[PDB]
Every structure is written in structure tokens, then in C-alpha cells.
Symmetry: D5
Subunit: 90 residues, 10 copies
């Protein structure tokens, strides 16, 4: 699943790889579930899709907190922008 | 690029879609750049790859803050876990 | 995501399409998470991946019950084979 | 497999073989079902519907195997399958 | 699902498209099921995979017979080569 | 091209893999060539595409005969259904 | 299958598209068949794969001749390099 | 890039593979460039796309001549059909 | 990942590979971000996406400069065409 | 080939899209050609592959100049970094 051979990757790089792809997959799931909630024509199914969608957000947040704790620049950039006021850019 | 016809998706759902796939691509970029930093055998290139990696992290954080401000569940779950000290589970 | 024009598909066919891919999505997550749990060298991360892994199993089970309730043959085949003993073939 | 088999347990690799099989049957059910709706030939429609329902059978068989070889599969399947009332309230 | 717009495709062409991809997908399943039978280290799973494998062959055979009945060249070439003896390339 | 490591696949299994994917590729070619025959607005091109289409059918039939001769249940199931009359679901 | 919408593509451009991808698919088939001919351990199959391989070359040549006849730059460049002697880069 | 392990493929088979996929790439570029020439609304870009397109045709022809010189059946079939007059089904 | 085995590649060829794909991915992001800038209906998001778009151009430009310094024909062709007045098809 | 419907994209954005993908595919060809040049064991093919490789570099440079002329931030960032000396990070 990695793009360079494992033999040349540090342990810490492969562990961050596992978390990042996990966040990606959860993000993708949130997006698709959200679209199916809008498009679904069965309310029972919609309730399931909406419930699962929100748990995927939880999974992404958990794995993202791990990344923050194990990468100096994730912690720096997240602290800069998350739970801030005014223009997100400046 | 969406999985459902745009005609059945709310406008707010499609804007969150644009943010989500933006974070995904930045995350993918961080991961690939990080691997090339480890595998690179040219110091000049490694410096570029490491610099760009760190800005991709910035892009993800910026877009993720937007999601936090425009989706209550993102805001709830991000508030629970982010900047916590202690077991994540 | 449908392979046929939506104009010709019954609603229940498209809703089952949404449910089936949801199960597929979750099953893929279960498998990948499980492999990362084995391969991970950080216990903290492993705890997260194992927790998420088991909730994906929950998502699949929820969506599969919906399929059981909205498809006569899903219900027949799930009734035949699930929660049984002995050879799974011919049972 | 997304990790090298050298670090995966044999039980993990067997569940991988089962999970992928359920996925492929689920995908076949979905595609067959759509072609049944779209087919304009009576004899083809009958074949596709016959195969569709056997793909459900394949998935159910392999899904039972997972139930017997993974405690959490057994737990979550037991919670939700063959129930009445809201699926999101259980 | 098709390469050209459905507007310009004849009806029979789209039906044969549905049959062909069904044969393709069944063949793909036979191959993957067969490889997992060799690699599986669990006898109960191996029995399931082998059972499903052979049913996929039946699905492929059914849909291929439909193709034979609805396409003159499928019927001709399948008549030339199937159930024959001696070098296949010969006939 | 195989899903499992060659270390664990029987020789015969890999040869059937080579035949199966060959039939798949020819079938895909038949399908796409046929769609291009319908859509083409150049008769010279249509004549080539139709000629190639029918030879891809020949390739598939040839490779399928080999599978029939080297796999018992290919032979059984093909014998049941091919060159028959009445409903195929039988 | 078209990178751009058909509404803006001239019909001649889409016809050349159909020929180009046909040649591409045949080239891919030649390559794969040739690799399977080398790796196969069953002579009967090898003979079939080798036969099919060479007919795929014929399909590519046929469709390529059509391109030569319907594109002036295909004709120019195919005339420069095909059936020549000496370094290809210097012809 | 190869569908079989390099250990069982002859040297010359792998070289023809490198030539074939190169022609495939060139053909793909020719097609896409041509489509962008039709859809482009900027004359400067269209001039570039058309110039690059025609050089991709040159690349394909060069590599194709190499195949002709290193594969007897390529030489046979190209000799049969190229630079001819009359129906291409000949 | 690479197409040829890493055992037949020079160390420089693989480093240029690492540079090229970085440019490709940066270019892809510029294109996608720019399309989202046009389609977005939320000004906040539009400002973020437009900001990220322009930083991707820097990533592409930086990595492209590295290629110029590490490949003779990149230096030649980039010297010929970039920062020039007149038609690009004649420089 | 665009990710948003062409109805919501400005005309100039789609023209830059056509240029960008052209540069991307040209870069992709350069990379693959370069790897085949290293791995090829036939000198005559290597000479062809190396020649085509360098013309792909030319195509990318041409299309890249057009982008520089039709996008203010491409012109800014390319001016900053191309044809410089010292560390590219600063
Ligand atoms: Ca997924
Ligand atoms: Ca036009």
C-alpha cells in the first residue's frame, strides 16, 4: 500500500501512513454517506446512513488526534487553524 | 465526481464534498511526500519534498477548520478528541 | 455509481444499491483496519484502529439487517445460514 | 492485501479471503439487480435474476463463516439481525 | 457502463453487453475463488469458496448459452471449438 | 496479475488463470468492438471493427474450449446448458 | 470514453478516437498474450495464446491502415519510418 | 508493469513490452491531444496541442518500426495492410 | 511506484521519478482546486481553495526547478520556451 | 474529464485544465520513458525511447509557457524559482 519500499521507510513513517489512509477512508465514507442521505428515498435506510456517517466523523477525529500527537507539524498547523475566529486564511 | 446526481444533493452537501475531497488529497500528498523524504537520496530534493509536505498539512488543517465551522457533528467530534491529553479511546 | 440509467431503475433497486455499497464500504474498512492492527507498531494507534474496525462491523450488520427486511431472498438466505452449526454448504 | 503477509496472522489473512468474497458477491447482487431492471429480453432477465439470488446465497454462506470465526462479527450480527423496530435503536 | 452513448446503440447490442459483462464477472469470480482455494488455510472456508467457484461457472455457462442463441457468430464459433478433440487451434 | 502469491498457487491453477483472463479480455473486446460498430459513422472503419469483433469471439471460444478440457466442472456446466432448447433456467 | 464532451467534438475526431483505442486495445492484448506465452506451462494453451496473439497484431495493422488513410500526419510519419533500414532515430 | 514475473519472461519479450506500451502511450496522447484541439477556445494553446499531437504520431511510428524489425508477425501483418488500396478486409 | 524493477534503475532516475510525480500531483491539485474555486457557493471555502491552489503552483515550480538543475534536456527546453515573447510553436 | 460540471466553470478555467493535463501526461511519459531507457537491453530501442523522452520534455515546456502567459500566479511562482541558484527552499 506504500509507494516506496518498506525497507527504506522509517517505522514512524509507516505508522503515520496507516493513520493518514485511515483518515482518508473515513473522510471518503463521510462524503459518500452524506450524499446517500440526501438521495435516499427510504427513511429507515436514511437513518442508518446518517448514523454511520457521524461515526465515521468520530473515527477520523480520533485518528487525527493521534497524528497530532505523533507529528510536530500536524500539531503546529492544527493548533493554528482549528477552533479559530475570523478568516481561516489569516 | 460525486456519487449521486447533483440534482438530488443539497447545495450545502456539495460544498462539504468539496472540502472533504480537498482534505483527502492533502492527506494523500502528506503521506506520499513523507515517503519520498525517507527514500530520497538527493538532499536538495529532500528539502523541497519536506517543505511541500508541511504546507500540505497546513492545507488540510485550513479546510478541516472550515468543516468544523459548517457541520455540527464535525464540530462536536473534533472538539472531543483534538488537543486532548490522555488515552484517545 | 449505478451501472444502468436511473430512469429505468426502480426506487427500491437504487436504495438497495445504496445499502449494498455501504456494506461493501464497511467490509473493506473492516479488512484493512484488521491488517493495520496486525502490522501497526504503535499500541496507541492499534487501539484506535481496533476500535474503528469493530464499529465498521456494526455498520455492516445494521445495513445488512435493512437489506434483510427489504429483500425476500436476502431474508431467505440469511435465515438459512446465519446462526447455525455443521457444514455451511448444504445447511 | 495492503500489508505484507509476513506481518499478518494466518487468521487475519483467512478473514481477508472471506470478507473480499462477501464484497464481490454483494457487488454481483447489485449489478445483476440493476441489469434485471434494465434488460429488455425476457430470457436474459430470468438468467440475471436467478444468478442474482445465488450471489446472495454465496454472501450469506461466507458471512456465516465470519460470524463463526470472529467474536465481534458474532456480537454485532446477533444484535441487529432478525429484529423488529428501529435498527438505529439497538 | 458502456463506451458509446445509449442513443446510438442498438437494443440487442445493449442486451449482449449485459450478458457479456455478466460472463466476464463470473469468470473473474471463478479465477479469484480458485486462487483463494489454493491459498486458504481454513478447511471450512475452502469448502465455501470451492462451492461458490463452481456455481460461478454455471452462471457463466448459462449466460454464454444466451449469447449463443442471440448472436449468429457466437453460435458459429462456439459450434466450431466446443466439445471437440485434437488440437484446438486446428479447427 | 494474481491475487495470491505464486508460492501457494498450484501450477494448474495459474494456467487456468491465464486462460480465464484471456477469455475475459476477448469478451471485453467483443463488447467494445460491437458498440463501436453501432456508433461508427465511417463505413470502412465499421467493416474493420465488425471483422475484428467476430475474431475476438473466435479467440474466446478457442480459449474456452481449453478451459473445458482442463476443468471438470467447466465441462459439466457447459455440457448442461450449451446447445440446448427451452428455458435456460433448467 | 471521450476526454471532452461529444457536443464539441467533430465526428471525424470521434471516429479516429474509435480507431485509436481499438489499436491500443490490440497492442495491449499482444503484449499480455506474449507474456502468457512465455510463462504458460501447458503447450496446448501456449499454442492458443500464440495464435490469438498474432491475430491481435493483424487487427492493430488493419485499424492502423485506416488511420493512415484518414490522417495526413499519420501517413507522413508512417511513411518515413516503416519499412526502412538504418537507425530509426535518423530516418 | 508486466503481468508475469520477469524471471519466466525472455529478455526480448520484455523489450517488446517496453516498445508496445510506448506506442500505446503515444496513441493515447494523440487521441487526447486531438480532442483538446477540437474543444479548445484559445488559438495559442490549440497550436501547441496540435504540434505536440503530431509529434506523438511520430513517436508511435518510430517505435512501431522497431517492433516490425524485431517481430516476424508484426512485419508480416504491417506489410499486408499498410500503404495499400482497396478494402482493408483483404 | 516505479514501472521497472528498482534493481535496473540508476539512483538518479528514481530521484527524478520522485520529482516528476510530485509535479504531476501538484499540477492535478491546481486544476482541481481551480475548478472548485469556480463552482463553490461558499466564499470562505472559495478563499481557502484559491489560496491552496496558488501554493500548489509553488510546489510545482520548486520541484520543476530541481528537475532543471538535474536533467540536461529539462534545462535546455525550459530555457528555450519559458519567459519568451512570441508564438510558443516557434522558439 | 473535469470534476465539476462544465456549466459552472469559466471558459478560461477549462482551457487551463486542457493545458495542465497535457503537462501532466507529458511528465508521466518522461518518467516512464526514462525508466525504460535504464532497463532496456536493446540499444536501438533505447535510442528511440531516449529521443521520444526528450521531446516529451519539450512539449511540457511549451504548454507550461502558455500557462505562464495565461495565469498570473504561474508567472509569479515560475519566475521566483526557475533559473535560480542556492537552496530552492529559500
Ligand atoms: Ca473505502
Ligand atoms: Ca471547435
Amino acid at each position: 500500500s506504500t509507494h516506496e519500499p518498506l525497507e527504506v521507510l522509517k517505522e514512524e513513517t509507516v505508522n503515520r501512513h496507516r493513520a493518514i489512509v485511515s483518515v482518508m477512508e473515513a473522510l471518503e465514507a463521510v462524503d459518500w454517506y452524506d450524499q446517500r442521505v440526501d438521495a435516499s428515498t427510504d427513511p429507515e435506510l436514511t437513518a442508518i446512513l446518517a448514523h454511520n456517517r457521524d461515526e465515521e466523523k468520530e473515527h477520523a477525529a480520533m485518528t487525527l488526534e493521534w497524528l497530532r500527537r505523533n507529528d510536530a507539524k500536524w500539531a503546529e498547523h492544527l493548533r493554528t487553524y482549528l477552533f479559530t475566529e475570523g478568516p481561516i486564511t489569516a
